[PDB]
DNA sequence: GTTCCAATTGGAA
DNA sequence: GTTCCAATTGGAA
């Protein structure tokens, strides 16, 4: 039914796990899991660290609550053991997914 | 004298090559070769693509040129055949060095 | 429809 | 004295 990703006990189903083509790039697979671990609006209103951008402290932008550190830690643990990538690659794939989810939400308006 | 880097025909200091510790990270070594291939004033005025930032298209920033594509292509060629890092990593290390060298000038 | 590019920034590392 | 982290952008791929 469901499978724990990492030591923290965060889990997704085997159905969506088996519905993934592992022939594509790591970051893309990471984005596929984020829509399976988190929801759409959560990714759109959260960031990787919960910090504001240093390049916008003048004009500012909506402060976003930090994503779950425990859930992300398992994802980083997965990709580094399965696809054998670096945590830097994963955390960059994550921080660019939340940003793209923020774009798309604005596209409905 | 000086040693070529890639097929596009760009060379670097033969001494400086020997003075590089390859035990370091990919991006690190890449940031050491850039200062030996490009002048510091060039890095502080040039970028990877030459394009401006999409987040600052209305906020007009001073124009910064593009680094020599042939010189960059050889740099990317070296790291992939030696340290076996990805072209992604190399191009990201370059766009930071050019951004960091600009921070040096801004402080001065 | 989604991802990639890479430029910009300040403090932290 | 340098590098790293990652947030944010709009068009390009």
From Swiss-Prot, chain B:
Q: Which cysteines form disulfides?
A: none
Localization of this protein: Nucleus
- All residue ranges annotated as the BEN domain in the record: 6-105
Q: What does this protein do?
A: The heterotrimeric Elba complex is required for chromatin domain boundary function during early embryogenesis. It binds to a 8-bp sequence 5'-CCAATAAG-3' in the Fab-7 insulator or boundary element in the bithorax complex and contributes to its insulator or boundary activity. Elba1 may act as a transcriptional repressor and binds the palindromic sequence 5'-CCAATTGG-3' to mediate transcriptional repression.
Subunit text? The heterotrimeric Elba complex consists of Elba1, Elba2 and Elba3.
Domains as described in the record: The BEN domain mediates DNA-binding.
Stated name of the protein: Early boundary activity protein 1
Please give the organism: Drosophila melanogaster (Fruit fly)
Q: What is the lineage of its organism?
A: Eukaryota, Metazoa, Ecdysozoa, Arthropoda, Hexapoda
Q: Which residues of the full protein are shown?
A: 250 to 357 of 363
């Amino acid at each position: 039914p469901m499978v724990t990703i990492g030591p923290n006990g965060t889990e997704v189903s085997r159905i969506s796990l088996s519905a993934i083509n592992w022939a594509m790039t790591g970051p893309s697979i990471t984005r596929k899991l984020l829509c399976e671990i988190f929801d759409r609006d959560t990714l759109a209103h959260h960031t990787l660290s919960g910090k504001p951008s240093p390049a916008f402290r003048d004009c500012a932008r909506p402060s976003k609550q930090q994503l779950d550190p425990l859930k992300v830690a398992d994802l980083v643990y997965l990709m580094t053991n399965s696809c054998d990538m670096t945590p830097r690659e994963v955390r960059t794939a994550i921080t660019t997914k939340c940003a793209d989810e923020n774009k798309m939400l604005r596209s409905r308006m």
